Amino acid sequence: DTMKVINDPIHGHIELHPLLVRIIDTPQFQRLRYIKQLGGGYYVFPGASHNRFEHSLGVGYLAGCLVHALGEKQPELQISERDVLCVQIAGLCRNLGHGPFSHMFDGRFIPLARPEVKWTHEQGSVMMFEHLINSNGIKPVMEQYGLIPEEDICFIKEQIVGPLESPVLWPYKGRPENKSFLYEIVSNKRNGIDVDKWDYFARDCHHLGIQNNFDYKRFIKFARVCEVDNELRICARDKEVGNLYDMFHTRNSLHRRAYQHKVGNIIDTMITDAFLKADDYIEITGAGGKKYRISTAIDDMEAYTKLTDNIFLEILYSTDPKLKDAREILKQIEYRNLFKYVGETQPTGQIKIKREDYESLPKEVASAKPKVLLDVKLKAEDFIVDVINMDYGMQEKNPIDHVSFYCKTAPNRAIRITKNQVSQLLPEKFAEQLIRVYCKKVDRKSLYAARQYFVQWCADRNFTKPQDGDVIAPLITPQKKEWN
Amino acid sequence: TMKVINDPIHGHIELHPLLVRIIDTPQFQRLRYIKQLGGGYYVFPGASHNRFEHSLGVGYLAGCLVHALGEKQPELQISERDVLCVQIAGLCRNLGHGPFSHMFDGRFIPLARPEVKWTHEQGSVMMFEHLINSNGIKPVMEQYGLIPEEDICFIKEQIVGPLLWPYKGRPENKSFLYEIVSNKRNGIDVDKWDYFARDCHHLGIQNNFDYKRFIKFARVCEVDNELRICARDKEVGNLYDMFHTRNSLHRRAYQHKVGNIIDTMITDAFLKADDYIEITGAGGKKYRISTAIDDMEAYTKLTDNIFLEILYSTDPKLKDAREILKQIEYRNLFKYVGETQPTGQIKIKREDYESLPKEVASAKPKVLLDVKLKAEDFIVDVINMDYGMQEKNPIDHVSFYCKTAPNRAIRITKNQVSQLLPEKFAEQLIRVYCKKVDRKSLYAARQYFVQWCADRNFTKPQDGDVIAPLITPQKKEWN
Amino acid sequence: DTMKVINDPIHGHIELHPLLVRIIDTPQFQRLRYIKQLGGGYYVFPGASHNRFEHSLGVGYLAGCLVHALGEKQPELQISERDVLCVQIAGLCRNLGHGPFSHMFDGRFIPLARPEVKWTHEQGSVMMFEHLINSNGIKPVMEQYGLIPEEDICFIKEQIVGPLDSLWPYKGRPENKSFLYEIVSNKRNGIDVDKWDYFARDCHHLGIQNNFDYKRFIKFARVCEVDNELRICARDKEVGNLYDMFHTRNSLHRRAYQHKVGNIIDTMITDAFLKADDYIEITGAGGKKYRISTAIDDMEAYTKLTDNIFLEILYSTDPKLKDAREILKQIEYRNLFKYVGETQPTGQIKIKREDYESLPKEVASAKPKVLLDVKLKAEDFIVDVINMDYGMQEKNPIDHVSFYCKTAPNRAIRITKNQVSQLLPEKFAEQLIRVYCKKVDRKSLYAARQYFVQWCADRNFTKPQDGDVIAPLITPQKKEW
Amino acid sequence: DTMKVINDPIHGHIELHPLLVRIIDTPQFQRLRYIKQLGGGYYVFPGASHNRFEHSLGVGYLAGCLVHALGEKQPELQISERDVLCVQIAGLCRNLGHGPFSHMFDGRFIPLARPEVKWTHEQGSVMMFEHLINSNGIKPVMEQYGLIPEEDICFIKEQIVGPLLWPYKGRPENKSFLYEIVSNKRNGIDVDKWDYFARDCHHLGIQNNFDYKRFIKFARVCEVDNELRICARDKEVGNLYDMFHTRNSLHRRAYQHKVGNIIDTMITDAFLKADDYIEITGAGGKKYRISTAIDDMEAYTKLTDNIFLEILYSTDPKLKDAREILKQIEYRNLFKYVGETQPTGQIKIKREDYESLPKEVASAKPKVLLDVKLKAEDFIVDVINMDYGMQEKNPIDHVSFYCKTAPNRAIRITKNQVSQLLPEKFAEQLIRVYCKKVDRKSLYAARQYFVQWCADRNFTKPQDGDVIAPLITPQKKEWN
Ligand SMILES: Nc1ncnc2c1ncn2[C@H]1C[C@H](O)[C@@H](COP(=O)(O)OP(=O)(O)OP(=O)(O)O)O1
Ligand SMILES: Nc1ncnc2c1ncn2[C@H]1C[C@H](O)[C@@H](COP(=O)(O)OP(=O)(O)OP(=O)(O)O)O1
Ligand SMILES: Nc1ccn([C@H]2C[C@H](O)[C@@H](COP(=O)(O)OP(=O)(O)OP(=O)(O)O)O2)c(=O)n1
Ligand SMILES: Nc1ccn([C@H]2C[C@H](O)[C@@H](COP(=O)(O)OP(=O)(O)OP(=O)(O)O)O2)c(=O)n1
Ligand SMILES: [Mg+2]
Ligand SMILES: [Mg+2]
Ligand SMILES: [Mg+2]
Ligand SMILES: [Mg+2]
């Protein structure tokens, strides 16, 4: 019928087009009210109670702001109301595929439960969207507001997941090359600068109790479309380059402080463990009454719709003896009897730890032979090793090398700006790995031992000296001249 | 040792290890799964916050105030033991809240168990007892210099009031300690201060009350042979503003017409599910949503999760309950018809609440109607808005002091402050909703409602002339 | 010439049309950088360093927001770019007439220096605007962007000061654009974008949180026909917020704008200006010399009249300025006139401006009945009478607001107080009386308190809040207390 | 005399001890109400109306917070109320020496007006403090609250300017940590930065990412090389690198804004042209100039941003040139920015060479057709040294940490133990060029000279180089 206004603490009063309201008021979208944006982070930052639902609204809103702003400044782009709605819908719907505890689910649980499968929340989002549309009669409503479901549904999915085919050339079908800039708004595959980041920086910071340094409104004011290699792309004003390096610095800061918090991660790990132990016994009803497991609900969207953080409490409150082991792990979380952090280190020089080797690392730690007197001997199964890849969103690459700029004197001429033209105070590398070790045995003597093994293992592997190495393992650190 | 927690409202808070021990229990962690504002989250999407983090905030502010009093007035002899007891009461005064907070004790329990008298306060005391006993907290209390017999009594009295000087946990010279966490005298306490700041931060409303300022100007003075907390005289304006703010937040957020109808629909689903949901309590015994309040072990497991357990159920017994919740997801809500108030001396009694839908349906609007509506099609919600003490002005129950004589307590009357203040401190709002959502039913509902307002001499609804143009002319008082 | 972007801490990045930039980059506008928004308030709230310049930008921006929003929701109103620019210019320029220390200048100084004259900053703003336009060749630039200077300059002035009887008293725009006159300075009910900026800005600087949400109000605003005029109407639901807006404004006056010490600093600075008025020379048109009190008669001189006057006096060496300089030095040492207390008339007693001067005499004539070391005279007392209201004297401004309902968005309606809440104010205007003593020693102050409380008793004013503590021998005589 | 409560928008309600109130309520301190914290920055960021006065209160407040927090956690340090007051006073008084438009005055004006002299606002602050104490009878009041003026005044001055071997006399080595609070000479981590980050951000419209309250919670005193020093928890090292990143961001965005700087430059020009004619009365009625008021504190007390308006509103023909420059600011007829570049070579451009740079630019021979020829005096070259506060050095190498397992054992943490994503260098220079000739043809020419000069000197390619000087940039293969 008519536009709704929603009060968001980040963005203020947002107007929602009635088509978007229709998309939001569905079981598939409302589901996101029951999935914490930061997963286990809430168990460390008590303000982070926010869910994916409200983040989704924010992304939808910002996507519309950016496309409206481009259209207002450059009418020659011929951006239609139809384009605007499609970009907003993609913004609203790019989080639809998230599972219980967000990144815990696709980062930890699915890889261990279904190692053969290749699943991402992105793929999930496309499938959920299709299901949402078909289950709720949205196509007619789309037609009613001037959308063309065939081409526009394709466009929306492409915005979320990228090209739907191997093209080897313009690989997209939803819109032609003259609207290429529309594909940079919601999920920017070229350099990662998109409205999804802008919402979460502001939102997460507001809830975590950290201040956000990046100003997206400013960026929107200075954004333009220019021709670059026969494509119309979004370009930033030259003097905004510093702000973009700061944007990636901020993202990395938030990962260091919050998203990869050592305890937040171990809680995610413990919850994953409980889910693995419960996977054989929890039943989720999907299409036609078929029963699915936590690990297989991703194969049926009707079942996936019912897969939320609620799983955690269903396990916790269970009485079935089959779920006793799973339930015991979650109860250890409530009593704050968590696996203990032992320490952190990094590979040196060129060493790069491969995903294939992740499983062998607890074995390596337990095989270390620290020359120290020990009351307990520990085994591989007592250790957890968490490898975390930190980067600027593009592996080893500098994402600012993939950004186009324009100058005040020639607003339609796109240019490139190299790192050396900006500052010598910027990073020389754009990717690194952190290795965290934890012990499942929490008593004082086990922990003392775990520390000796860990520091010995660092020495053996030529990893960096842990920050507290000399205090936790004073008998081990002297053997390594490189550390002294 | 002490833990540091980052709260977005208060910054980095330090927690004494005894408090950490209380927090890391199933009974306290439970509060992570109970939304502070209940159905409000379905209207204000930023209001995802739960009772857990509000509890931390209250505990922190309680310690701030008692610490500030001790530092300014060492002659009060506030001990570390006193400080911990006040902080614990602050942490634990929300323990008794049920699913969707005020929905549970404001709507559900009254309907499910009309004979019983339950408040979240009473719940908090029982939960606290259970928390202490289940988790071996008494020894830990002793280890930090608390005396469990007296101090547990003190903590409970702080939460629920008296279980002559009616308190046993502390003597009259420490009377001021009973004003911090839950202030029975005038409602000015640290619980409000946290929720103002917290709710505002998440709702997207800006808070006008400055509790840090109030703490800077607070003192203890002798008042009628009690040592009480007194405010500086010139802070009287800020206190009237505090109650104005609280009332604003109720108008805007806590009593939002749609937030309330969602709470009402969820309550309805819970009533229809109550016979079939089983919650396991002590010794494996089974309880219902409505009886879990009788066993704390069962109550520990009663959270907002009930909503999803119903929503995801496949049992045909829960089909009716499940349908109501599904209507929430599709946003097929009962429809708001309008709002009015009693005039003059009229006051609607709780005993009459159930007869009101019947009255509305009995109205005889002189208008042509496609459909005829029945009592069961109407919901009438009566909301009592006040400054926390019925008809009374809470500032008449506040003691002040002046800069020239800091130890001399005084009273300040409304007329000494401003003539721009309220003349009344309590009112009732009546909201009417229709369970029949189609265009023709709604049109009819509006005619009944406005006719009923006219019959009862209630105030003219704001949109009365637009929704019922044929009805409003009959009432000269309305024009 | 292209748009400039400016970063404001209240509003974020604001775009300024090149015509507005041209208006801003003039001596007449830049002048506002040297005039504190809150005057003597900075001497109490150290965060209130803000000046009228940045408040002006904010008002200009919000004016454009509201008119853009109305045009976007209701294209049938035919709001032109020309209309938008005129409203933004009026927003930018409505503070041009402010003098040194803002409300100190027209609230205290001019009334005492030039009692015969009737001056308001509004009138000042119109005159300054005219001077700004003419001095800087702005008329051609206006033409270049599609404005018609004759009509549009008239429109801008009318927005600031009102009509320069009749059904339609305005010449700048016809009745079908009536709603444009409600944006910058709303004469009908006071709800305008000037308040919205200062609520947000003052709060941000004072360290008080603002509770009024103007972005919400903009979303719900519409134009409807009311008594053959097109007016801005608010959604019915929003009536509570509007009462809260006036409550907030009153709160900010109580806490900040009428702070007892902020006011006494304003008073002392005014006193210094009065004692310096004969000796400070301000050069105006054709080299003529003016005084602080007469610079309002020449805009070229007025352009040079800012808070700088304070420091010119303070740093002076001329013995002529010794008395003025001494008062300002007392401010630096914080040897301020002392606050004695506050009271109010009872019920419907009202004090009038003609009587203000006789009040120090009345206080000094009181005969307390208490042992006193010192006897005080009329010249030792300052009596400050402050009229607090909701912007329209005794009237409820919400009775002058039009609303619409969700079921009929084009039908305007009225909402009375009783349809909203019984918890709202029963009166919308009141007076506060503050007494101060110029003699600051302990004994004088003790005495001043006895006179004050006795005078309250004699006049049947309300009992001061600390009356029983400051004058325990006086308050018992009054049973009503 | 009792405590006063003051409402600050950054810190909330702050309590001020009556001795501090006495120090504040003096002409020498109140002066700071008339000196903008960010100088010409207000002419670019309209929210930056804030003055040094309120920043000084903030620093005083934060200094007391930190010293109280250390005393509360570690009573064995024997921190006295006397220590607390001395640290708070130093915090309040470290900005006393600032001149008109803050860093414009000692960064630009004094170096040009008095090239022979070596003046810093720090030195100014000690001299102003001495003058404040003596002029206002503060010593007796200090005694009244248990201070010992001889040793405590020395302590306060040392906190501000450093030593006037354990080089300090105000306090012994067992109180070394007290010297790290207000102006930290060792690594730059002090409460002054914490206030200005929060305050500047609040006013500029930029969000601050550094959390000082958190840092205070984790701070401890430990023994390091026979000194008791403030140590940070090991975990917090990342936050400290972020602190310096933030400081550098604020310099890039705000403090060194290209237009903010050129306004500072133009105001400095006006002051130089007015210096012979403005008279400031100092001790015994002696007259001083803007450039010599630093030699008499009584005169310096009267030297504030007011000078700007005194010049602007002047009618004296002697001040006509100075007044014209300021009027160009009001009309926004500013010197024009031409561009920015950096050295590639490791030697920093030296301060001794700064003056020769406009000559070099004008001597460039761009191979381009030009309507106008420009001269050295038409160019301004601004050299800006950006660093993490310690020249080429990493300040985090000068920080001591402790671990949770051994709180009393101080340790060091090297860059490689933290991250590979951190800077490899900690100092750099930016070179900005501006033209005093503002017309279209002059500016076109200025751009050709500038880019040619960058090419000749092997500086980095300006960001818009290809657009502003398309005929010049091809000659340089390193840029292509
Ligand atoms: N860098 C940071 N900035 C802001 N908040 C943080 C940061 N790191 C953690 N927090 C939050 C999360 C918690 O609520 C609180 C305490 O976290 P943290 O200091 O890491 O405790 P911890 O228990 O993990 O460390 P430890 O046990 O090693 O002392 O602060
Ligand atoms: N109601 C208020 N809310 C917030 N800040 C306030 C309020 N009233 C005053 N302030 C500010 C102004 C000052 O920065 C600070 C102290 O002012 P205030 O409490 O009025 O002291 P005062 O010196 O005027 O009163 P007194 O000397 O009578 O105690 O608080
Ligand atoms: N005083 C208020 C009231 C509401 N909101 C927020 C809460 C909602 O997220 C959003 C829209 O709520 P409304 O009450 O304005 O809209 P409704 O749909 O309830 O009213 P209606 O449908 O009658 O327009 O605004 C707010 O910020 N301040
Ligand atoms: N990193 C920055 C730079 C500027 N600003 C603010 C300060 C100004 O008030 C406004 C405009 O600054 P710009 O530097 O963008 O404008 P200029 O005129 O300096 O740039 P140009 O003329 O080259 O567009 O934005 C900001 O918030 N952050
Ligand atoms: Mg609605
Ligand atoms: Mg810990
Ligand atoms: Mg510019
Ligand atoms: Mg005072």
Side-chain angles (χ1 to χ4, degrees), chain A residues 34 42-43 49 54 310, chain B residues 32-33 41-42 48 53 305:
Chain A
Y34 311 112
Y42 177 43
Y43 293 84
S49 60
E54 49 266 36
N310 171 257
Chain B
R32 289 181 181 284
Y33 311 111
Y41 177 43
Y42 294 84
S48 61
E53 49 266 35
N305 175 73

Side-chain angles (χ1 to χ4, degrees), chain A residues 4, chain B residues 256-258, chain C residues 235 406:
Chain A
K4 285 198 185 294
Chain B
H256 191 275
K257 75 212 184 261
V258 186
Chain C
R235 174 71 187 273
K406 164 157 90 149

Side-chain angles (χ1 to χ4, degrees), chain A residues 37-41 44-45 48 50 52 103-104 108 196-197 199-206 208 210 250-266 268 386 388 390 436:
Chain A
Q37 177 81 8
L38 301 187
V44 176
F45 288 86
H50 57 120
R52 285 269 159 197
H103 288 267
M104 187 216 78
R108 296 182 181 281
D196 179 85
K197 287 185 168 60
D199 182 78
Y200 84 65
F201 283 13
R203 195 169 306 277
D204 292 345
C205 283
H206 174 87
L208 289 165
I210 292 168
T250 292
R251 175 174 170 275
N252 189 64
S253 265
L254 290 172
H255 276 273
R256 286 278 187 155
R257 296 178 185 190
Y259 313 140
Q260 307 299 335
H261 191 271
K262 74 212 185 261
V263 184
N265 282 4
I266 205 58
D268 280 339
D386 210 27
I388 297 142
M390 301 285 277
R436 277 89 168 274

Side-chain angles (χ1 to χ4, degrees), chain B residues 310-410:
Chain B
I310 294 168
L311 181 70
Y312 300 148
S313 62
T314 48
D315 190 339
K317 286 185 285 200
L318 290 167
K319 193 160 189 302
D320 289 312
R322 184 165 63 244
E323 270 306 306
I324 290 164
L325 300 190
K326 287 180 176 176
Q327 283 345 285
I328 293 169
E329 286 201 299
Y330 291 108
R331 211 75 182 180
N332 291 320
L333 312 177
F334 301 151
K335 302 304 304 190
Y336 173 75
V337 179
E339 182 176 59
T340 187
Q341 306 184 258
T343 294
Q345 73 286 325
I346 308 303
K347 171 56 153 57
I348 306 188
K349 315 190 229 300
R350 186 155 276 266
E351 68 214 57
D352 290 316
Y353 287 7
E354 269 194 5
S355 76
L356 297 174
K358 159 115 294 280
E359 286 187 19
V360 176
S362 303
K364 299 171 83 197
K366 297 88 150 82
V367 167
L368 198 63
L369 297 175
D370 285 336
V371 314
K372 191 193 204 77
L373 296 172
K374 329 235 165 187
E376 63 210 306
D377 304 326
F378 291 105
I379 287 149
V380 182
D381 208 26
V382 180
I383 296 142
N384 297 301
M385 301 284 278
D386 63 28
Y387 271 27
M389 290 178 75
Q390 330 299 89
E391 302 296 337
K392 299 171 219 168
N393 181 354
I395 311 310
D396 292 338
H397 299 267
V398 175
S399 288
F400 299 92
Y401 71 89
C402 313
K403 164 157 91 146
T404 57
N407 289 321
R408 182 164 172 167
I410 62 165

